[PDB]
Amino acid sequence: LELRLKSPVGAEPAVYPWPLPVYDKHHDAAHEIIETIRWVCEEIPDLKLAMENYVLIDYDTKSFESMQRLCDKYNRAIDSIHQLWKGTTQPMKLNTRPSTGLLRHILQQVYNHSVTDPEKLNNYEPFSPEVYGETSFDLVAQMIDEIKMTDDDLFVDLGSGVGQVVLQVAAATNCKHHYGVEKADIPAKYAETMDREFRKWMKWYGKKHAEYTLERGDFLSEEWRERIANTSVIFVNNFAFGPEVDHQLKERFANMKEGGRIVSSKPFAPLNFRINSRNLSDIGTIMRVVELSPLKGSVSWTGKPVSYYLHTIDRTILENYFSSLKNP
Amino acid sequence: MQIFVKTLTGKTITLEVEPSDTIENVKAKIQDKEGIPPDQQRLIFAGKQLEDGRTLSDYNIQKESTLHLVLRLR
Amino acid sequence: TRKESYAIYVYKVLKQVHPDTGISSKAMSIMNSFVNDVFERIAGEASRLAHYNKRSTITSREIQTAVRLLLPGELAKHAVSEGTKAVTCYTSA
Amino acid sequence: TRKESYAIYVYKVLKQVHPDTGISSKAMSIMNSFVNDVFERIAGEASRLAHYNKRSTITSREIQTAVRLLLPGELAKHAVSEGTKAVTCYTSA
Amino acid sequence: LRDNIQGITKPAIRRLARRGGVKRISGLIYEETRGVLKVFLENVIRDAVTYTEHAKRKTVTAMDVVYALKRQGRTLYGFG
Amino acid sequence: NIQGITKPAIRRLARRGGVKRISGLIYEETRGVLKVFLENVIRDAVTYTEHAKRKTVTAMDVVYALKRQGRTLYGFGG
Amino acid sequence: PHRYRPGTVALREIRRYQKSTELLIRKLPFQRLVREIAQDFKTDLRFQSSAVMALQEASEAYLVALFEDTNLCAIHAKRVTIMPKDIQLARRIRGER
Amino acid sequence: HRYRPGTVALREIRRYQKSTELLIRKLPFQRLVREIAQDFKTDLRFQSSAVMALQEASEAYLVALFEDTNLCAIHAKRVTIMPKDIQLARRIRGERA
Amino acid sequence: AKTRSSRAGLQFPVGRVHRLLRKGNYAERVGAGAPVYLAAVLEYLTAEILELAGNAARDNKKTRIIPRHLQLAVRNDEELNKLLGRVTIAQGGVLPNIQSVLLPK
Amino acid sequence: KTRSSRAGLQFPVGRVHRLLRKGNYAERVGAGAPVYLAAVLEYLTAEILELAGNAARDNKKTRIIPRHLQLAVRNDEELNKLLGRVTIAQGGVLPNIQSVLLPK
DNA sequence: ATCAGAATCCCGGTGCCGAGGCCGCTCAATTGGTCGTAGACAGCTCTAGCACCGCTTAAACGCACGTACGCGCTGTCCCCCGCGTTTTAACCGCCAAGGGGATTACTCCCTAGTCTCCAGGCACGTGTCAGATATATACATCGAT
DNA sequence: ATCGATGTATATATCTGACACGTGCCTGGAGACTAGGGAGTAATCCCCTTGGCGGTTAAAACGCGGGGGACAGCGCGTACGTGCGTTTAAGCGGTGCTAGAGCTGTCTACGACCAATTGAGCGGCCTCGGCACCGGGATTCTGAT
């Protein structure tokens, strides 16, 4: 006694048993099928015409067969698409990237079906690097708008959580391989299932992501001294790591080369930094700090919006100060 | 012999040494014409990092050859 | 009478941050009176913190938590951090 | 484990003013926390008048001029007189 | 824990104003005072917690809050 | 003496504060505020000078009055 | 039935409340407020049950002083009704942020 | 020619908020202080800088006062300051009872 | 007697104050007139309040002093209020104080 | 070796270590404590002279005068809140005018 | 609006003076160098903070009513502003004064220290009288009829 | 206006509990005696404050004229108050759990004192270059047109 959704791209179907389980307050597998038919009709335009016909309001989540009724009407229409693709109609593009409306559906589907218990994401010791804190849906999609990435570029997160910042970036651009390094335990135990389902949820919806891995262990292990020195783009949530934990990140940031861009909550370096013979040790001599625009309509616990600060390793200034001590 | 020191910033200096000189006397003479703090200077010869008391004759860099300078932050 | 002040030490710290700037003899006496006043506020609290634990020694630890009371939010974040490194540097020497 | 107070002394002072009156234990621990506060202003003022005049002592002359500063007008004018009587009465006896 | 600042009710602030002598309250004061009471408590508690961390304890006694208000300039009699 | 504090000088102070238009009964108000204020300072200033067994009010005795007042002054040798 | 005129009720509260001494804010909603603010400075802090009574006493005696000095201002502007550009005024004059 | 009333005064502000010099002469203020010190003790000599310190205080106390006074009068929909305001502004600080 | 309290005719313990000036690091050397002259001043201020509380308690016809009385003691005075203008008294209350225009016409 | 050079300070460590003993601020003093204290005072007098120097160029002057400290302090909102009670000699106030006083 | 009309910036020159190097002489800062005693971990123990939970019920809450009060506008009456003439005292320079502050000295008598003595103050202890609840009159007042 | 009843004032008695009084038990107050050391006074000192002249030259003072502003008031639309029903959620007191606060244990490394040596710091010398000042120029608003 289950519910079946036939794959529009010919992959293995996703089966959800009855009764349909509840993941959290606002994302459950019963309503998730309503959006699944809603977003897959956005995928195949001929499939959208099949659900404009004869799909009336009168279907409810309490009834099994009535939820099955739209599902059985979906399963009849997928067979109409696959026989249409065998003729002169070209198939849907498989190697494309999911749009933000479809990256809305897939990642939350990975967030729900992999991470069963979100309460276990909150079992930590506070005021520590073990403090769990995730990112909003828009601000990572804001970085997709505002920050340019390529294949020589490599997006690696520090303290990824369940890793949805890498997931929203590895699906966005084409970096060669990603790392999400996790000192926390319980979102890393979910990251094994976040890795399995998401690679499968790019099979069922049929889009492309980049190569990624969410890794458990130490980001302050001494292997990652040069592995950070291999990284181009580094995301870090330094609100409550502790500054000596951030100072040991400043140890690993002494070995980074040109073009490194760090997007972080608490500034390593002030916006109004100035180089003099007192702050020769400080980190603002080599990177410029600019504040990315915090989200409109987003109030945090303090009352100010969450500020992530764009950096850029630019060693231009440091020789210029050394030149302007000769000058005049 | 004279050597050439090519940096990461595109700027290359024309610095004149002896073939027997130590890097410490070079890093002092880099502090002459460039004034960059030698305790924040970091030199590389071709995968062999220059150490202070070590010479050129330890490393046997040829005349009119190319070095690499890195700006380390203390 | 040979009187003491901090008149020379501020002049060194001025040349670290601005070599091309001097400081006149009126606005020297402000910075002389200033450091004589911030020292009395901080070394006032280390008197008050020791009695409350009924101890009789100002360690380096009371100054660290006298500063986190007495200065504002943002400014105390650097000054505590600037202090620890100087003790750290003092430990190797 | 001793924990002192000024509690028994107010019972003497209360009965010599209103002998037909009592006092609750709530408003007892106000008057215990009042004398501890008036002390540490007066005893905390002679700490400055000793060192503003480069001295090391505390006579009954500093304590007289610590009361002059702290208490307001008509109240200061009696408390100096009530004190100096008890210096002289301790003196001749 | 989240959002207990609505727990200070609308008739609570109403009771406080009548002790001061307010005959007639407007309607927007109830969102002002929930801002005034929060900012006042963030300066008392921050100092009192900082006394606790110096003593190497986890328990905040009544003789920490009094040493927070005394330094603040609001000396409290009656709790030791 | 307090009469000697003029009419335009109080008009010179209030322009520093940002006042644009001044009434007429301010001029015996602000003489009255000032005459209070010095009776708090000098009474404390004299009481330090009484204690030092002197008759010459130094610069320090005015500064120690204003510290104790909570009106701390920088720039006279604190 | 009967109706009091508007205003005659509140004048009877002011005479009633200015004689009483009990804490006008309730005991327990206030305690879930103090533990929440103290949550974001250090976690796992145990409050004595006499230290929570300290914060309730000192936070009424601040706010009563606020509404006394609110109410000198609204009468000063010939009004009777207190408005939030009085509370933002009085904290500006006392020198607060 | 003729200025509008109130056009010079917006220039007298800008002239005085850029300057540093003492706005109350030296000589009558000094003869004021020797009055008030006479009621406490006779034959008190003042150092030259010990009157300067009073003049740095008594200006910078009054200049602070008219800043706080002018906040009151704008609050009451006026421009003109009046002696109910100095009696108000000195009251909220608690410097008056 | 052998007590220094009764040799001066005081109540407050003159021996204790001579200790508390020492173990407080107020100064090094404590003169002989210092505890005796001080402890008289403490006696006068506390007797000043319990008089004025006693005049306000018996007009409320009660036996003991409760802290509602001490609030009425200080706040109805001129010179105790200027000293204790930075004091919050626990469970005190405020004065009866209604402004001019708030009374009904 | 001094004891400022052994930790990289410019402020003295002799003068501070003495003044904790002349004051009776406590009985005995920990040995790393006057180091920590002179670390702070350096940072605060490198904080003022930083904001002093910027605002001194705008008047195209070379030396620092007491008007420049007054403009360094009341502008910064983290030194204003520390130095709230203190008047500064020869200072003056910030150039600031109300909104309703500007003409039409 | 566009002129015009003084204000004030701002400057190109120079002239006094005070800040920035320079000297040198002394006294506080560093050194050992040994010690004693305050402090740190260790262990233990009961203290009350915490969790919680059923049970009555005072306390918020939602809403309908309506009236008194914030608010906008008008004006009108006159107070401040601005300007121009007229007068006083601040101001600088001044010089002479001489009192009082400042440092040295000299020695004394008060304070600390130590050992000693004991009893007043403190915590338990039982006993008791002020009070608060619970109700019952007593007053008197506020708005309608 | 006086009903009127509502809220408040005062009063009744009584069982609860909160001091008020006693035991004796324990570290601090008191004596005194001895040693040293800061403080009192004298003695002079050389500055720096009071004092008063004399002329200049801004600044205060007088006055009057025009008008923008505060003041009293009306109108009118609405938002805040009072009351009645309704519904959570504190408050109680109940019981257990245990984390941890507090006290002692028990040795100890850290800091102080004494003495040794001397280099950094301060006072007085010079002196330059920065602003003060000057009298000249562009620029910027104010008000009338």
PDB file of N, CA and C in Angstrom, chain B residues 16-58:
ATOM      1  N   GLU B  16      72.462  42.802  -7.568  1.00  0.00           N
ATOM      2  CA  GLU B  16      73.833  42.405  -7.852  1.00  0.00           C
ATOM      3  C   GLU B  16      74.432  41.818  -6.581  1.00  0.00           C
ATOM      4  N   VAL B  17      75.032  40.633  -6.698  1.00  0.00           N
ATOM      5  CA  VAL B  17      75.541  39.877  -5.556  1.00  0.00           C
ATOM      6  C   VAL B  17      76.945  39.380  -5.879  1.00  0.00           C
ATOM      7  N   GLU B  18      77.491  38.576  -4.964  1.00  0.00           N
ATOM      8  CA  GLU B  18      78.628  37.709  -5.233  1.00  0.00           C
ATOM      9  C   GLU B  18      78.135  36.275  -5.390  1.00  0.00           C
ATOM     10  N   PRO B  19      78.892  35.395  -6.077  1.00  0.00           N
ATOM     11  CA  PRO B  19      78.485  33.983  -6.151  1.00  0.00           C
ATOM     12  C   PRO B  19      78.591  33.246  -4.827  1.00  0.00           C
ATOM     13  N   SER B  20      79.355  33.797  -3.886  1.00  0.00           N
ATOM     14  CA  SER B  20      79.535  33.178  -2.584  1.00  0.00           C
ATOM     15  C   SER B  20      78.560  33.685  -1.529  1.00  0.00           C
ATOM     16  N   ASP B  21      77.787  34.734  -1.823  1.00  0.00           N
ATOM     17  CA  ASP B  21      77.015  35.436  -0.801  1.00  0.00           C
ATOM     18  C   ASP B  21      75.884  34.588  -0.239  1.00  0.00           C
ATOM     19  N   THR B  22      75.572  34.831   1.032  1.00  0.00           N
ATOM     20  CA  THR B  22      74.439  34.202   1.685  1.00  0.00           C
ATOM     21  C   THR B  22      73.149  34.912   1.309  1.00  0.00           C
ATOM     22  N   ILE B  23      72.028  34.221   1.527  1.00  0.00           N
ATOM     23  CA  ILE B  23      70.723  34.815   1.243  1.00  0.00           C
ATOM     24  C   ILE B  23      70.421  35.906   2.258  1.00  0.00           C
ATOM     25  N   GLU B  24      70.986  35.774   3.461  1.00  0.00           N
ATOM     26  CA  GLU B  24      70.803  36.777   4.506  1.00  0.00           C
ATOM     27  C   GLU B  24      71.437  38.107   4.114  1.00  0.00           C
ATOM     28  N   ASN B  25      72.593  38.063   3.453  1.00  0.00           N
ATOM     29  CA  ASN B  25      73.178  39.288   2.923  1.00  0.00           C
ATOM     30  C   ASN B  25      72.415  39.758   1.690  1.00  0.00           C
ATOM     31  N   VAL B  26      71.781  38.830   0.968  1.00  0.00           N
ATOM     32  CA  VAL B  26      70.886  39.226  -0.117  1.00  0.00           C
ATOM     33  C   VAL B  26      69.612  39.844   0.448  1.00  0.00           C
ATOM     34  N   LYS B  27      68.997  39.183   1.444  1.00  0.00           N
ATOM     35  CA  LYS B  27      67.759  39.691   2.042  1.00  0.00           C
ATOM     36  C   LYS B  27      67.981  41.011   2.771  1.00  0.00           C
ATOM     37  N   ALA B  28      69.196  41.238   3.270  1.00  0.00           N
ATOM     38  CA  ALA B  28      69.561  42.577   3.711  1.00  0.00           C
ATOM     39  C   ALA B  28      69.651  43.541   2.531  1.00  0.00           C
ATOM     40  N   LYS B  29      70.186  43.085   1.393  1.00  0.00           N
ATOM     41  CA  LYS B  29      70.298  43.975   0.242  1.00  0.00           C
ATOM     42  C   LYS B  29      68.978  44.088  -0.507  1.00  0.00           C
ATOM     43  N   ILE B  30      68.058  43.143  -0.295  1.00  0.00           N
ATOM     44  CA  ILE B  30      66.692  43.369  -0.756  1.00  0.00           C
ATOM     45  C   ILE B  30      66.040  44.445   0.101  1.00  0.00           C
ATOM     46  N   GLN B  31      66.443  44.531   1.371  1.00  0.00           N
ATOM     47  CA  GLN B  31      65.929  45.581   2.245  1.00  0.00           C
ATOM     48  C   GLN B  31      66.531  46.937   1.873  1.00  0.00           C
ATOM     49  N   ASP B  32      67.642  46.926   1.131  1.00  0.00           N
ATOM     50  CA  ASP B  32      68.204  48.172   0.624  1.00  0.00           C
ATOM     51  C   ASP B  32      67.341  48.782  -0.472  1.00  0.00           C
ATOM     52  N   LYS B  33      67.192  48.086  -1.599  1.00  0.00           N
ATOM     53  CA  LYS B  33      66.582  48.709  -2.765  1.00  0.00           C
ATOM     54  C   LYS B  33      65.065  48.620  -2.776  1.00  0.00           C
ATOM     55  N   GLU B  34      64.478  47.677  -2.047  1.00  0.00           N
ATOM     56  CA  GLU B  34      63.033  47.556  -1.998  1.00  0.00           C
ATOM     57  C   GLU B  34      62.434  47.939  -0.657  1.00  0.00           C
ATOM     58  N   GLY B  35      63.169  47.776   0.443  1.00  0.00           N
ATOM     59  CA  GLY B  35      62.690  48.146   1.760  1.00  0.00           C
ATOM     60  C   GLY B  35      61.596  47.270   2.319  1.00  0.00           C
ATOM     61  N   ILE B  36      61.245  46.191   1.627  1.00  0.00           N
ATOM     62  CA  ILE B  36      60.216  45.247   2.047  1.00  0.00           C
ATOM     63  C   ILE B  36      60.806  44.518   3.248  1.00  0.00           C
ATOM     64  N   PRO B  37      60.030  44.270   4.307  1.00  0.00           N
ATOM     65  CA  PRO B  37      60.573  43.637   5.514  1.00  0.00           C
ATOM     66  C   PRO B  37      61.041  42.222   5.237  1.00  0.00           C
ATOM     67  N   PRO B  38      62.333  41.939   5.446  1.00  0.00           N
ATOM     68  CA  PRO B  38      62.859  40.595   5.144  1.00  0.00           C
ATOM     69  C   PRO B  38      62.273  39.512   6.020  1.00  0.00           C
ATOM     70  N   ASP B  39      61.904  39.859   7.251  1.00  0.00           N
ATOM     71  CA  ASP B  39      61.144  38.963   8.111  1.00  0.00           C
ATOM     72  C   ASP B  39      59.712  38.731   7.620  1.00  0.00           C
ATOM     73  N   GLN B  40      59.225  39.519   6.655  1.00  0.00           N
ATOM     74  CA  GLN B  40      58.045  39.155   5.879  1.00  0.00           C
ATOM     75  C   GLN B  40      58.353  38.870   4.416  1.00  0.00           C
ATOM     76  N   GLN B  41      59.616  38.642   4.067  1.00  0.00           N
ATOM     77  CA  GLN B  41      59.964  38.172   2.732  1.00  0.00           C
ATOM     78  C   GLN B  41      60.116  36.658   2.734  1.00  0.00           C
ATOM     79  N   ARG B  42      59.865  36.042   1.584  1.00  0.00           N
ATOM     80  CA  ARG B  42      59.925  34.596   1.445  1.00  0.00           C
ATOM     81  C   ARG B  42      60.393  34.288   0.032  1.00  0.00           C
ATOM     82  N   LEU B  43      61.599  33.745  -0.090  1.00  0.00           N
ATOM     83  CA  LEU B  43      62.216  33.511  -1.389  1.00  0.00           C
ATOM     84  C   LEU B  43      62.196  32.029  -1.753  1.00  0.00           C
ATOM     85  N   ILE B  44      62.016  31.745  -3.043  1.00  0.00           N
ATOM     86  CA  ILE B  44      62.025  30.394  -3.597  1.00  0.00           C
ATOM     87  C   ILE B  44      63.008  30.360  -4.760  1.00  0.00           C
ATOM     88  N   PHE B  45      63.893  29.362  -4.767  1.00  0.00           N
ATOM     89  CA  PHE B  45      64.626  29.014  -5.976  1.00  0.00           C
ATOM     90  C   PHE B  45      64.156  27.660  -6.481  1.00  0.00           C
ATOM     91  N   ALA B  46      63.205  27.683  -7.422  1.00  0.00           N
ATOM     92  CA  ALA B  46      62.871  26.550  -8.293  1.00  0.00           C
ATOM     93  C   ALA B  46      62.430  25.312  -7.509  1.00  0.00           C
ATOM     94  N   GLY B  47      61.700  25.544  -6.423  1.00  0.00           N
ATOM     95  CA  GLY B  47      61.329  24.450  -5.550  1.00  0.00           C
ATOM     96  C   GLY B  47      62.278  24.234  -4.397  1.00  0.00           C
ATOM     97  N   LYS B  48      63.363  25.001  -4.333  1.00  0.00           N
ATOM     98  CA  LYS B  48      64.282  24.976  -3.206  1.00  0.00           C
ATOM     99  C   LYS B  48      64.251  26.338  -2.534  1.00  0.00           C
ATOM    100  N   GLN B  49      63.610  26.395  -1.370  1.00  0.00           N
ATOM    101  CA  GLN B  49      63.404  27.638  -0.641  1.00  0.00           C
ATOM    102  C   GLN B  49      64.735  28.151  -0.111  1.00  0.00           C
ATOM    103  N   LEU B  50      64.967  29.450  -0.259  1.00  0.00           N
ATOM    104  CA  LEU B  50      66.205  30.036   0.220  1.00  0.00           C
ATOM    105  C   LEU B  50      66.127  30.213   1.732  1.00  0.00           C
ATOM    106  N   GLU B  51      67.123  29.678   2.431  1.00  0.00           N
ATOM    107  CA  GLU B  51      67.278  29.850   3.870  1.00  0.00           C
ATOM    108  C   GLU B  51      68.325  30.935   4.100  1.00  0.00           C
ATOM    109  N   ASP B  52      68.224  31.626   5.245  1.00  0.00           N
ATOM    110  CA  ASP B  52      68.957  32.873   5.481  1.00  0.00           C
ATOM    111  C   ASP B  52      70.468  32.685   5.448  1.00  0.00           C
ATOM    112  N   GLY B  53      71.007  31.895   6.378  1.00  0.00           N
ATOM    113  CA  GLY B  53      72.435  31.647   6.436  1.00  0.00           C
ATOM    114  C   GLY B  53      73.006  30.874   5.269  1.00  0.00           C
ATOM    115  N   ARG B  54      72.165  30.179   4.511  1.00  0.00           N
ATOM    116  CA  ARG B  54      72.597  29.449   3.332  1.00  0.00           C
ATOM    117  C   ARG B  54      73.030  30.417   2.233  1.00  0.00           C
ATOM    118  N   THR B  55      73.922  29.941   1.370  1.00  0.00           N
ATOM    119  CA  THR B  55      74.562  30.770   0.361  1.00  0.00           C
ATOM    120  C   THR B  55      73.869  30.633  -0.984  1.00  0.00           C
ATOM    121  N   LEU B  56      74.517  31.199  -2.003  1.00  0.00           N
ATOM    122  CA  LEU B  56      74.223  30.788  -3.368  1.00  0.00           C
ATOM    123  C   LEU B  56      74.958  29.505  -3.702  1.00  0.00           C
ATOM    124  N   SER B  57      76.169  29.340  -3.161  1.00  0.00           N
ATOM    125  CA  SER B  57      76.989  28.184  -3.505  1.00  0.00           C
ATOM    126  C   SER B  57      76.474  26.910  -2.852  1.00  0.00           C
ATOM    127  N   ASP B  58      75.665  27.035  -1.797  1.00  0.00           N
ATOM    128  CA  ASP B  58      74.900  25.889  -1.318  1.00  0.00           C
ATOM    129  C   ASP B  58      73.880  25.457  -2.358  1.00  0.00           C
TER     130      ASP B  58
END
